[PDB]
């Protein structure tokens, strides 16, 4: 359905969340490889959805951006405010080796699960509010995959228009666009 009228591929029918027939190349021909790629897609999408609010809320209050700190950054904890006035325990270390030591744990306890559908939608322990035990589960999976894809595109943006204007607000860019809608656009990096 990504293109109206375009015939659906024989292995991409409207059964699983998404399934809009978007496979110009055909990387998911093998059913098992397709099943693995679906899980890869959900992991990427969930990471992107988590990341984007962490780049949208902080600056809106006027505390910098995701370019604020990735190397040689605020030593007195988190800047000087909000995240606790130099409250955070990991005050001085900026290249903080406690974050790439627990995501490894989350991986390691994640990998190694049978039942692909449960490999991807664990439920149970990971369903505190019990939304999965309902009749609209398929709709919810569709909504999750849709904002997941949107978040993936949004973070691709974040990356490219962080590399195109080194030092800027990925939402003060919206301010720049709104101040000059028809005068300042992507054209600056596309056509000078």
């Amino acid at each position: 359905e990504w293109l109206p009228g375009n015939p659906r591929p024989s292995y991409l029918d409207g059964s699983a969340p998404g399934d809009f027939g978007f496979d110009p190349l055909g990387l998911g021909e093998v059913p098992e490889n397709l099943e693995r790629f679906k899980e890869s897609e959900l992991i990427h999408a969930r990471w992107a959805m988590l990341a984007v609010p962490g780049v949208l809320i902080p600056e809106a209050l006027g505390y910098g951006n995701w370019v604020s700190a990735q190397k040689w950054a605020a030593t007195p904890g988190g800047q000087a405010t909000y995240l606790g006035n130099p409250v955070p325990w990991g005050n001085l270390p900026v290249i903080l080796a406690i974050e790439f030591l627990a995501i490894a744990f989350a991986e390691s306890q994640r990998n190694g699960e049978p039942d692909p559908e449960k490999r991807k939608y664990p439920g149970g322990a990971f369903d505190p509010l019990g939304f999965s035990k309902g009749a609209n589960l398929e709709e919810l999976k569709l909504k999750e995959i849709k904002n997941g894809r949107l978040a993936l595109v949004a973070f691709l943006g974040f990356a490219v228009q962080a590399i195109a204007y080194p030092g800027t607000g990925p939402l003060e860019n919206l301010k720049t666009h709104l101040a000059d809608p028809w005068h300042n656009t992507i054209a600056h990096v596309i056509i000078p």
């Binding site: 190349l25 055909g26 990387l27 021909e29 093998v30 490889n33």
Partner: protein, 222 residues
């Protein structure tokens, strides 16, 4: 039934036409099965030819690409430099990248080792790279019966060669372009020594005044 370049009675005994680029050219008899050994044997020489040719395809299209793209004016001019001035040979020329070329070489050795050792282990023991766990994508790197043509979901993701005739013709085309690229890289090296400028500069010099810009006029080095 086929074109013969410099065949012989000895060469034509074992060169029959199964290989893609098989034209009987074996004046030194290096692929004679009677004395097959470690690296001089029928199983390795075609594979080594294919690999040298593929790296030569990347080289001939890479040792001149920055210069061409800077001549047409879409990459920065300071990156539009001859291949030998890109830090590969620091004495003739050097470039400052994000890391010094020895750190880059160590990183290259690590990555190319992880790739090349796996390729070797699939050559010696076919299918052995699809068993042990490798970040979960060991199933893509299983390969096929022929070491030079894995053709997996990664190494073949547009899916060429569905039929055998087009597949074989495409093999022959690959071998020919690879031989051409190998000879081209040899030309790059010799012209770099004898001229001091990039291959595209040599091409443009020849295209400008062909009779006063050639090997005969230009073995004065400078």
């Amino acid at each position: 039934k086929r074109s013969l370049i410099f065949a012989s009675k000895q060469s034509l005994s074992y060169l029959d036409g199964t290989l893609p680029g098989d034209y009987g050219f074996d004046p030194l008899g290096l692929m004679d099965p009677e004395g097959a050994g470690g690296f001089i044997d029928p199983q390795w020489l075609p594979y080594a030819e294919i690999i040298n040719g593929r790296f030569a395809m990347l080289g001939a299209a890479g040792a001149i690409a920055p210069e061409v793209l800077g001549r047409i004016g879409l990459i920065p001019q300071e990156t539009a430099i001859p291949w030998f001035q890109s830090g590969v040979i620091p004495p003739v020329g050097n470039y400052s990248y994000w890391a010094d070329p020895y750190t880059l070489f160590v990183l290259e050795m690590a990555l190319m080792g992880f790739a090349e050792h796996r390729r070797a282990q699939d050559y010696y023991k076919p299918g052995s790279m699809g068993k042990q766990y490798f970040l979960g994508l060991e199933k893509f790197l299983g390969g096929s019966g022929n070491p030079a043509y894995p053709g997996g979901p990664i190494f073949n993701f547009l899916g060429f060669g569905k039929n055998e005739k087009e597949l074989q013709e495409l093999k022959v085309k690959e071998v020919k372009n690879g031989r051409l690229a190998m000879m081209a890289v040899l030309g790059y090296f010799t012209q770099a020594i004898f001229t001091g400028v990039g291959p595209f500069q040599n091409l443009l010099d020849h295209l400008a005044d062909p009779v006063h810009n050639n090997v005969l006029t230009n073995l004065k080095i400078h």
